[PDB]
Every structure is written in structure tokens, then in C-alpha cells.
Design a protein around this ligand. Structure first.
Ligand SMILES: NC(=O)c1ccc[n+]([C@@H]2O[C@H](COP(=O)([O-])OP(=O)(O)OC[C@H]3O[C@@H](n4cnc5c(N)ncnc54)[C@H](OP(=O)(O)O)[C@@H]3O)[C@@H](O)[C@H]2O)c1
Ligand SMILES: NC(=O)c1ccc[n+]([C@@H]2O[C@H](COP(=O)([O-])OP(=O)(O)OC[C@H]3O[C@@H](n4cnc5c(N)ncnc54)[C@H](OP(=O)(O)O)[C@@H]3O)[C@@H](O)[C@H]2O)c1
Ligand SMILES: NC(=O)c1ccc[n+]([C@@H]2O[C@H](COP(=O)([O-])OP(=O)(O)OC[C@H]3O[C@@H](n4cnc5c(N)ncnc54)[C@H](OP(=O)(O)O)[C@@H]3O)[C@@H](O)[C@H]2O)c1
Ligand SMILES: NC(=O)c1ccc[n+]([C@@H]2O[C@H](COP(=O)([O-])OP(=O)(O)OC[C@H]3O[C@@H](n4cnc5c(N)ncnc54)[C@H](OP(=O)(O)O)[C@@H]3O)[C@@H](O)[C@H]2O)c1
Lengths: 244, 230, 244, 230
């Protein structure tokens, strides 16, 4: 029997936020394809999802890989009808020490990848007259952070891209939205001290760090029928760290 | 039994959809109408999972009597949805003091009054949801609606201040800003090329009132089909 | 000889920001009417402005006073063509201790006064096909501050009011804008300790408290021909305390 | 002598108005064009109060040569106005990699590159103005402009980050977002019921580059006639 569930593609699904998003979309009833940067990582995803998802190796910096991955999904599982752009890294530096590579690599991994993957999935969504593109942004696209001019520019760019695309695709009942996490407990915050986590949580109105599941819950909502009249927005999930 | 939600203006439209959805979600819903007859209709619709009460949100005495009644009979209000409203549009040159004041009182003052009155129960519970219905026109301005736009924008700023005050007690305070909701030129302005339905707003309120939105506070959730985008 | 300069009305011009705005608009060439809450305060303003302005007593809570003041200006100096809504106070309290009076008095002094004064001056601006309404808002209408739910609601309301009015009056070449100060050195910050002023200035990107003249400079710009294509905006003057 | 301003794309339109205004304000203005012929025309327009240089902001080598030349011959760049730009609009389905990349490079990458290159002189002076020309469409979205809107929104966020980095040295970093500027259906969307002129933008840049805006940093100054309001 053929794969019959709607297909979601979640980039960077190995851990933390990406992993929680992938698992929640599986629980919601999607067939989930998740990506990792290595075959070994991809195989781990495959095993975690069991027979309701697949893991694929992908470096989102490369158009040929993006095209190959989506073609593979279309040929084996179905058209990508939910796209979650989550994969990313940071290369922080004050501008006076921010190299051409530091800049280009971050813009390519974040903003260029959103452009490339969004463009590649539009045809299938158009034919379906259904689609969800959900981009993971950051509180830092709103609240200024020194040392992250590259990351902030990319994430803000993604939000503006999302608005333009939402206008273009709305008549096909495709929604395009962003989710902007605040302080979410991840590998990186785990590496910080208890004292610094307390300083962080004191700035959050809710007085605690969030969890990957909080971001998964937002993505889940946006990907659902409960959010069909929401498009071109940023859904802030930061515990009142930043309010708009 | 269940946690109690209070939904103001639950007789029809958006409020009715919200009240019915929160019932389906598992809340005991107290819905309000401006008449005793409207309040009875709600009691009859909700049956065992809710109650109807008459309330004019312009009046502090009624607000205090209504919440007291709920506390005596059903339990503390742990989800407050401030939805009751009207419009009295006019270009500023034709906008009377009464038209200004009545809109500010029904929308913004009521949010201040009801929010203040429910804080103690939420604080004791270390749980709460205050969900205020705003509007797209608090962002995308419309001539003739200076009173309504001022009130809804006020509500949003109120909500941010209160979110900061109450967050440590795990009370979230948020706004939902509907676009054009059906109660051709309009739907052409919307990216999705259709008007919204009350259920679209109920769905957003339902999300916010749930554990799925436990880390969301002080925000505006825009439900407008791409009529206005941030 | 009759009063020939364009007339500006600046509410609460006794000190700090209001005083600096009034004096700058005089330097710009306006005839400035400033207000104070007492006759004694009004007389001080009269003397400070010399023969290029007037002081009038006004409590902006009262419609009859607002109407009387503007009528007086029209009968003696000219139509109000620049309106600067600056007068105000705070009555801070956490919501559980914020009384009906605390709420009503702040909404009336800030938002109702803007509505009342704006409405009262429109006819003269309409006839002139020139007008500037400039409302003094606050960073707190944007950046959440506990204890100021009344003040934040009023200032945010003023900004939304300004947008609606800007749409209504734009075809008459009347602009309606707000200026949102951050940490400005005033009587109130003078009353704080050196330590607390240092904590404040550490949060400002420019690493210092602003001065009343910084707000006057913004108001001056908006009231000028250099800002004739700017309407319905908030001009933030906070040294990068809050960025949008 | 005077403080040096660099204005990219000063040949015509908004950039030309900015360059002429900054001259009137008292800056020595270095303006740029994409050709040697265009650069000569600027040198001739500016006379004693400015110079023209050829620059394609897509190229890092040219950016570095241009600023070095200015530093050798005129003084450190203390006011940088990033204005040079083009559009390559298309619906996303027809937007090629080249059309994406070229817009990102000319707009956003150039702002990164030029800002980085001028920091040292501004830091030494403990004075600086970086003024980036954005656009209303970074806020009020337009179909067909996903590349341009992404770049301009990126520029604004870049500007906020840099404003935080450089503020202690009294360097301000701000964006000016023009609406429809003339270079009927359009002017009906504008509250002021007319298109803007290049001078409206020059006036806003002039304000920001002056001591009258010494406490303004990390902001967007909207100059759009009420086409889009915050
Ligand atoms: N954590 C937070 O608090 C926070 C706050 C704001 C925004 N965000 C955003 O939320 C998203 C999740 O971030 P995170 O902190 O959870 O990340 P993370 O735990 O570090 O995970 C990174 C993921 O992205 C993948 N990845 C890295 N480089 C890649 C490339 N070139 N191509 C394809 N995939 C690549 C990684 O693959 P491998 O595992 O195979 O290396 C991994 O799955 C990001 O977009 C981030 O910017 C997070
Ligand atoms: N519809 C839209 O497109 C739209 C867009 C943006 C925002 N909103 C907001 O959504 C909310 C609901 O709007 P709607 O379109 O559903 O309105 P609606 O269909 O006219 O319903 C109004 C409700 O409020 C109640 N109400 C009116 N005045 C009241 C008072 N003084 N005290 C107590 N209750 C009162 C009414 O009670 P009775 O039935 O007893 O009269 C009714 O239940 C409002 O806050 C509105 O501003 C709506
Ligand atoms: N200072 C800051 O850092 C800051 C920050 C954000 C926003 N703001 C805003 O900027 C404006 C200036 O504030 P400020 O702190 O400079 O004020 P301030 O120095 O305390 O001056 C208050 C002024 O308003 C007048 N006033 C008070 N109550 C009045 C009433 N009922 N009717 C008429 N006039 C009245 C006072 O008159 P008398 O002198 O006769 O009493 C005085 O001239 C205000 O709107 C404020 O909300 C200031
Ligand atoms: N016009 C509007 O309504 C509007 C609205 C929003 C934003 N803006 C922004 O305002 C800025 C100026 O726009 P405009 O309307 O004045 O444009 P314009 O009249 O077409 O002028 C463009 C300028 O940029 C230069 N330029 C183009 N490509 C370049 C490159 N690769 N390297 C260096 N310089 C280059 C041109 O030089 P040559 O003369 O040598 O070709 C010219 O001086 C742009 O950033 C634009 O995005 C304009």
C-alpha cells in the first residue's frame, strides 16, 4: 500500500526544536520527512519516526541537494504540503570581526534556504490548493542583539519574504507564517551555567525557559485546520521576553 | 468540576463560536448577554456544560455581581475572554463625546475592570488565561474609527503590562486581532480571498486558552487572512 | 500690529520636555501658546516667551476649559496650526491596586485630551490646508512596563487615534504623528540616585540619558516643512533603549 | 575641512537629493555612480564641496578601494548613506537564483560591507551616522518583491544589531523607509493624496545625519505620506 498521509518536511530534525516539531507533526497524522547533515544522522531519524516518517541527509546550502531531496520525497512519499524551515547555525561576531564567510554562510543557511525550499515546494501545494510553509525565525529578528547582525538580518529577511509569499499564494489557500522562539531550553542553554539560566528566566515574564515542545505546539497549530485564516504573521513564543 | 471560562458577549457571532469551542475543549463556560432573555438562551444552548448571565460591561456593579455569582456557584474564573463590543463610527469632526466615551467604556474600561476582578482566583490557582479580542484596525487604520482603534490598541498595551505583572504566577494575557469576519471589495484586500468566520477566531482563542500556548504571553495573534501582516 | 506668525499650542509647557518644545518652536518662528495648570504657572510662561508667546491656565481634563482656551487663542493670536499634546501625569500601581480613579484620571488626561484638543483644532487647520498634530507618547506604549497599564493603554490609544486621524485629514495636508521618548533627564530622573541613572544609561545603546532638547528637536522636525510627507508615524527618541 | 559623507547611488533620484542636501548642511559629500562618466558629472555638480567616484557596490574590492581613496584624499567617512539599489521583481515561481542573489548583494550585502569598512574611522572620531535606505515594502508586503522586501527588512535588523554594538561610541545607525516616491492608483493609497519627492527623503536623511537626531538610533523613519502607518 502506498503512502497516503499528507507529507511534512522538517529541516534539521535531529534534536531540540526540530526533533520536537517532527514528532508532533507525526502525532498530528502527517508522514514526516526530517533532515540531518549526515547519512548517519538521517538513519537515526528514519528509526525514530518508524514507519510514519523518513530521514534524509541534506545540506541546505546546496541547491542541487535541495532539489534532489524534494524530488526524492515526491517520488516515494508524496508532495511536500507542510514545509518547516528549521535547520540552522549561528556564526556570531561583532561586525568589526564578522568575516565574509561568517556573513555569507548564515544568510545562505537561513534566508537563501527558505527561498530555495519554498520555491521548490510551491507547485505541489498549488495543485493541492493546500499548503503550510512555517519558518522558524527568532526573537532576535525583533529584539536587537549585538554580535548577531548576520543572523538577525537573515531571520528578519525570512519574515519579510514570508509576507510577500503569503500575498502571492493566498488565493491558492497556502499560508506562509513564521514562529519566533525566545529562550528555549536546548543543548546550547544546557551548556550555560545555572546562574546564567536564572538571569535569562528572570527576563521572561513567565519566569522560566521554554521547551522545544512549546515551539512544536505553535508549529502544530499553524499547520492545522485551526489556523487556516492565519497567514503572513509571526507567532511569538518567548514567554513574554519580548511583547508585540 | 471543570475550570470556569467567562466569555462576554456570547449571544452571537464571534463570542458564540468561542463559547461553544471552549465547551468542546472541556471548560465550563459562563457566557453573557445584554438581556435576561438572551442569557436564558445561552443557559439552554450550553445545558450542563455552561450557564448564561445578563451583563452590561459598562457597569462596574454588574461586573462585580456577575463574577461573584460565578465564584459562588461554579468556581473561580480561570479563563476570561473579553469579547463584548459595539462600534460607533464617525469621522472625528462628527464624533461626539458620548460616541467616544461609550466605545472606550465597553471595550477598554471593561477589559481593565474584568481583568482586575479575576486576578485573585487566577493568582491562587497559579493558572490563568486572559484573552482579549482586539482588531486589525488597531494596526491597519481606518478613517471613522478613531474611538474603536484607540480602545483596541489600548487593550493590547494593557495586555502587555498585565502579562509582565502576572507572568510569574503562570497567568498569560494575550490579544486576538480578527480581520474581516462574516457576521467582494473586502475579500479582495485579504490575501486568502475570503472573509473569516467566527470559528476562525474561536480556534485562535481555543489555542491560547490551552496548554499548547503555555509559553505565549503578551502577544497579538492576528487572524485576518493576510489582510494585515507582521 | 496684529499677530502674524503661525500659532503653536503646547500643553504642559512649564518644565522639562514641554518647556524645551515650546522654546524650540519659538526659535523656529512660531508664536507659541503654552499651558500650565495654574494662573501663576501661566504667568511664568508668558514672561519666558516674551512677546512671541502666551501662557494660559488649562486643566486638560475639562472640555469647557479646552474649548475656552482654544477660543481665546483664536480670538487673540490666531488659529492653532501646530498642536503638541504633552501635558500629563502618571498614577502607577499594579493592577490589583489600580483604582477606578487611577485608571480614569490617566485615560482622561492623556487620551481623552488628545481626542478633545485634536477635534477642537481641526476646523482651523482644514481652512488653512496646513496642520501638525504632534502627540507625545512613550517608549512604554511599546515596551511593556508593569505598574503602568493605565499609562501604556492611554499612550498606545493615542498612537492608534493618530493613525485614524492621519487617514481622515491627510487630503487637507494635515499630518498627525507621535514622538515616543525613552529615558529623558527630567525632574523625575534627577530625583533618582546616581546608581539608578547608571543602570538606566547602561540599557540605552547610546549609553546616556537623553535631554528635553532631544524631544524638542524631534517635535521641531515634525512641525517643519522637512516632514510634510510624514504622517501617522511614531518617531522613537530613546537612544536605542527600544528599537523598531 | 568638513566631515565627509559617502552617498552611494548619487547620480539621480533620491541619492542625488540626499547628496545635494548634505552639501547644503555642511558635509563634504562623496557621491557614487556605476560609471566613470556618471562619477565625473557628480564631481562637476558638487564642485568644491564634493567628489564623484565610480562604484559598483556588488564588489568588495571596489568598496575597499573607494573608502581607502576617500580616507587618503578627503578624510574618514563619518556619514554613510547606503542608497544604491535596483529591483528585479518576479513572482517567486519566476524568480531565478540570479534575480534573488543580485538584489541581496546590491542591497543587504553592500550595507554589511560598507558599514564594516567605515567603523574604524567613526570609532576613532566617537561620531558617526550610518543611514540605510529601506522601503515601505519591508513592512507592507507586495507580491513579486520577495527578494527586495527580504533585503530591506534584513537591512533594518542589521541596523538594530549594529546600533547596539556602536552606540557607546556615539555612532547612530538608522533606516529611512520611503513610500512611493516620484522618479493615480498609487496616490489614492497615500493618506496625503500625492506621491513623495526625492527631497522628502533627503530631508529625513538630513535630519538623522544632524545633531537634531543625536539620541535616535536603531529606528526606522517612515516617509510614506501615510501609505503605511505605525
Ligand atoms: N534554541 C533557541 O532558543 C532558539 C531561539 C531562537 C531561534 N531558534 C531557531 O530555531 C531553529 C532551531 O534551532 P536550534 O537552536 O534548536 O538548533 P540545533 O539544536 O543546533 O540543531 C541544528 C539543526 O540544524 C541542522 N543543520 C545545521 N547546519 C545545517 C546545514 N548546512 N544544512 C542542513 N541542516 C543543518 C543540524 O543538523 P545535524 O544535527 O545533522 O548537525 C540540526 O539538525 C533554528 O532556525 C534557530 O535559528 C532557536
Ligand atoms: N466582526 C468582525 O469582523 C470583527 C473584527 C475585528 C474585531 N471584532 C471584535 O470581536 C468582538 C465581537 O464582535 P462581533 O462581530 O461578534 O459582534 P456581534 O456579532 O455584534 O456581537 C456583539 C456581542 O457583544 C454583546 N454586547 C454588545 N454590547 C454590550 C454591552 N454593553 N455589554 C455586554 N455585552 C454587549 C452583544 O450582546 P447582545 O447579543 O445581548 O446584544 C453580543 O453578544 C468585538 O470586540 C469586536 O470589536 C470583530
Ligand atoms: N520624562 C520622560 O522621560 C518621559 C518618558 C516618556 C514619555 N514622557 C511623556 O512626555 C510628556 C512630558 O512629560 P514630563 O515627564 O516631562 O512631565 P512633567 O515634567 O511632570 O510636566 C508635567 C506638565 O504637564 C502639566 N499637567 C499635569 N497635569 C495636568 C492637567 N490635568 N492639565 C493640564 N496640564 C497638566 C504640568 O503643569 P504644571 O507644571 O502647571 O503642573 C506640567 O507642565 C508626557 O506626556 C509624558 O507622559 C516623558
Ligand atoms: N523610488 C522609490 O519610490 C523608493 C521607494 C522605496 C525605497 N527606495 C529605495 O531608495 C533607494 C534609491 O532609489 P531610487 O528610486 O532613487 O533609484 P534610482 O532613481 O533608480 O537610482 C538608483 C541609483 O543607484 C545606483 N546603482 C544602481 N545599481 C548599482 C550598483 N550595482 N552599484 C552602485 N550603484 C548602483 C544608480 O547608479 P547609475 O545612475 O550609475 O545607474 C543610481 O544612482 C534604493 O535603495 C531604493 O530601493 C526607493
Amino acid at each position: 500500500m502506498a503512502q497516503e498521509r499528507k507529507v511534512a518536511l522538517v529541516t534539521g530534525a535531529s534534536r531540540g526544536i526540530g526533533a520536537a516539531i517532527a514528532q508532533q507533526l507525526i502525532q498530528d497524522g502527517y508522514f514526516v520527512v526530517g533532515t540531518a547533515t549526515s547519512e548517519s544522522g538521517a538513519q537515526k531519524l528514519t528509526d525514530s519516526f518508524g514507519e510514519q516518517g523518513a530521514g534524509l541527509a541534506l545540506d541546505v546550502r546546496n541547491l542541487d541537494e535541495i532539489e534532489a531531496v524534494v524530488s526524492h520525497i515526491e517520488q516515494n512519499y508524496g508532495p511536500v504540503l507542510v514545509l518547516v524551515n528549521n535547520a540552522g547555525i549561528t556564526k556570531d561576531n561583532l561586525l568589526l570581526r564578522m568575516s565574509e564567510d561568517d556573513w555569507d554562510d548564515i544568510l545562505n543557511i537561513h534566508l537563501k534556504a527558505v527561498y530555495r525550499l519554498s520555491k521548490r515546494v510551491l507547485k505541489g501545494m498549488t495543485k493541492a490548493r493546500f499548503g503550510r510553509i512555517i519558518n522558524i525565525s527568532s526573537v532576535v529578528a525583533h529584539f536587537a542583539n549585538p554580535g548577531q547582525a548576520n543572523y538577525s538580518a537573515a531571520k528578519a529577511g525570512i519574515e519579510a519574504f514570508s509576507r510577500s509569499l503569503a500575498k502571492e499564494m493566498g488565493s491558492r489557500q497556502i499560508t506562509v507564517n513564521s514562529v519566533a522562539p525566545g529562550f528555549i531550553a536546548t543543548e546550547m542553554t544546557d551548556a550555560l551555567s545555572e546562574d546564567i539560566r536564572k538571569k535569562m528566566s528572570d527576563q521572561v515574564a513567565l519566569n522560566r525557559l521554554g521547551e522545544p515542545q512549546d515551539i512544536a505546539n505553535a508549529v502544530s497549530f499553524l499547520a492545522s485546520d485551526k489556523a487556516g485564516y492565519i497567514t503572513g504573521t509571526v507567532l511569538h513564543v518567548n514567554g513574554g521576553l519580548y511583547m508585540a
